[PDB]
Symmetry: D2
Subunit: 283 residues, 4 copies
């Protein structure tokens, strides 16, 4: 089985941590201290491509975050290790992060972190509902979980310009998203650049279905959406990001008019075994 990547009572808070491998000499000491804490429910783990190449192994399906030569900027800030903390107590995530940061401190240094929260029941700070057309029970498992229970997650930290977006007329805001804010109805007559029209999961030659487990965030860098896209492989995420960037037809997604990603990373989520997390292909 995988990790608790699909539990439908999604916690009110999240904490994403990203680590750089600085000293591979003390890496075994850090992993022996880390793996017994990964239960897949409150602490989830993803392995990056630099961590695979550092250990000489190559996990099937894993590769760095792609480089898209487009008119919009999708930065590739690939890290070695990704920790995903989920809980209802915002203080509990903070206290463990200080424990985890000290736990891996010889081998891994903290490169970036995001204090996430679930706005209302699941919304982006812009007011639009996030997760409407997300698949549900078992439809998630076909889309997000691989044959062996591993999953492949794409991470992007999007920074919103909430002041500029909320200053536009509602009719123009709706043409940017592709759905009406008042009742969450798809705008059939929206421009081709509308977000829902760009990412229509049924509008690809494989039904590029993914599971989105994003949360909202806010700190000194501003505020936006911590986008997390799970897939049985990275192709569902990548073909959509290429269409959003105008690399398929020349039409760029409307989200880039008010929001831009600061971070980009691909991570392999190993399966959950009976002794713990299954990092056997990597050790």
């Amino acid at each position: 089985f995988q990790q608790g990547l699909l539990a439908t009572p999604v916690p009110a808070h999240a904490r994403h941590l990203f680590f750089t491998l600085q000293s591979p000499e003390a890496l075994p000491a850090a992993l022996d201290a880390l793996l017994p804490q990964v239960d897949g429910k409150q602490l989830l783990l993803g392995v990056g491509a630099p961590l695979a190449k550092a250990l000489g192994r190559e996990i099937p399906g894993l590769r760095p975050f792609p480089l898209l030569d487009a008119a919009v900027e999708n930065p590739s800030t690939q890290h070695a290790l990704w920790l995903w903390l989920r809980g209802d107590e915002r203080g509990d995530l903070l206290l463990r992060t200080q424990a985890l940061e000290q736990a891996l401190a010889p081998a891994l240094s903290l490169a970036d972190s995001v204090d996430g929260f679930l706005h209302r029941g699941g919304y982006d700070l812009t007011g639009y509902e996030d997760g409407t057309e997300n698949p549900t029970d078992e439809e998630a498992v076909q889309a997000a979980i691989a044959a062996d229970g591993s999953s492949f997650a794409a991470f992007q930290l999007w920074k919103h310009d909430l002041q500029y977006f909320k200053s536009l007329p509602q009719a123009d805001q709706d043409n940017i998203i592709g759905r009406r804010l008042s009742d969450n109805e798809k705008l059939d007559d929206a421009p081709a650049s509308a977000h829902v029209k760009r990412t229509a999961q049924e509008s690809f030659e494989p039904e590029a279905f993914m599971v989105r487990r994003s949360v909202s965030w806010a700190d000194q860098r501003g505020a936006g959406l911590a986008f997390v896209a799970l897939g049985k492989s990275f192709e569902a995420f990548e073909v959509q990001l290429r269409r959003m960037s105008g690399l398929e037809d020349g039409i760029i997604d409307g989200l880039y008019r008010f929001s831009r990603p600061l971070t980009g990373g691909y991570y392999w989520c190993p399966p959950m075994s009976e002794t713990g997390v299954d990092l056997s292909p990597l050790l």
Copy 2:
């Protein structure tokens, strides 16, 4: 012809600005206010790959910062426009940044900025001399300036861990860089991982000579080196970075033990016409 990006009377302070193209409709209005201010001496301009693709043009040799599938992390955060301010008055550069930011307001939003300074007469906060094996005048013009007067500049914001690096014995510090700090003399018996052994400009299939116009920086993100590599094209910088990343010999550069890059970008510096900067291949 060329810009004054090589004048060895180097100013004491620098400011690097990076912009994202958010509304291409107002782009001509922004270019009209910017180009008359770019004299190549106190204000330099660099065009990014997304800016060319946004205009449907194709500059030969221009492409985004590469994506290296290596054991160390070299991020690619390519932006549309790069502005390089150089001056002796740190406050003057600050006031000009707010002026530039308002003049490009609707079309380009400020994505990243770096407050740089020339440490001592040219050293890295670690104390080592920076620019020792840099080519000099006339010897530079063939190595750093392209055939048509334009240059291809690579930018990386490196973040030092001065506390850890300066906590190591003086012998280990010298083996990481490859030179003795006391007199800046190459250690021929250093390990193959030494930075100077990795970056020996004569040990490539062309003598990959570049011009390094780097400055030190310090703000809330920490402190380090704002690396700037000029070249007649990007091959010199790329073959160097691949060897440092262990993509050529499997030996990783020792810089990654204490320093890591946060950003990465390729930029095309257009030649100076006599109207000003020559953006003819872009119109």
Copy 3:
């Protein structure tokens, strides 16, 4: 008559906003848009001493945060207006801050804000339960609410050093607080510097009882406690603060070993009428 300063089921999140009066000419336009939003439950209001001086009025019992010439540092950063936002959704409070800053735009500018949350059910990030010896029910109206529904609130933003505190032995942590962490029982044999020994509400003349409604916080300034002390006037808070600073017996509270306040302010919470909040003593 009072605001909802005493409701026991404390919401999971809070936001404290502090404003400086920049343009008193636009104050009438700002107050008419702000006062109908103060219900005392989800938005609470406190008036600072500078706001009284700006209107030439004199509120009985109101004054700036005191100046303690002590061996410890208690800052006095008194502001004009204090807005206290309470809610269960961390995202809603953030969006209302952007709404509140604009409605008060020309007259009042944001001087400081705090993103607060109730750790567990009411605990300090150090793990100790906060609010054990708070008064119960009507005893809080006797101690925190003045004659006319109004209250006098003291605000301090304390910054913890959780790394240092958690490294001490458990008995040293217990001797600093004055309670044992394992069962939350008072250490009668604790040193005179233990926090509970310093602020024992019955050990003063007269009995300095207050109601504390503090929440935990964490951002780029660190993490700590947003201390809020409610009293029928400021004498209870001040006499306790003076004993903690050693101005009564020479013994400094043990909290200053790992925590220090960053801000300090006295505010007058006006009574709640059936038309709204009563600013008649201020017009």
Copy 4:
């Protein structure tokens, strides 16, 4: 005998450090590492009132930064120790800051830091010349240095609103400062609220002369003026600050329209001996 607080060629860069006394037991070991480095030229020393109270000593003339019950906000953020770094190399001050906090670490913790610079030859970021009517030559020693080598310095970190100030008509800007920007001539017909009208050194009951050694600053907190007022006592600064706040006549200084202080502190600068700094009244 005095420190170099009056040298006319003021260095291009400054760095102000402020420390909180956390463990007074390790204070001797910290002072033993600090006093041999205080030469009064590149590293200057100011002692705060809390440091005197912690040692049970009492310096004549020293007291905490006052608390002014006015309509404007002047914070009192007194600290135990003030270190003033001056130099022409911005990077040298950065490295000494890490070295200093390392040496004073167990006893004193860093409470605040400012990265200052001298804009032009002595201007405020608004463009007005700063330091015109500072006394010169022999007149500074009678105004800034007491009967012994000691001076008494007041520090305030003012945060400017450069965007708002430069949007005002030039005559409104001139009426706020009280001097014309075109030639730096006093406007005798300016309103009584003009800054130069409030602080006219010869319009007090003694000719309240002080020596101002302020620099400009700019970081994440914004930008403004790091105000440093030197006097043989705090009486010159205090009576002026009280007039600017409208506590003497009711007229508030025009600086508060666009600028506000973030910090406030009084510091005693000990006399300089030929063995070091003389802290004998402190032992």
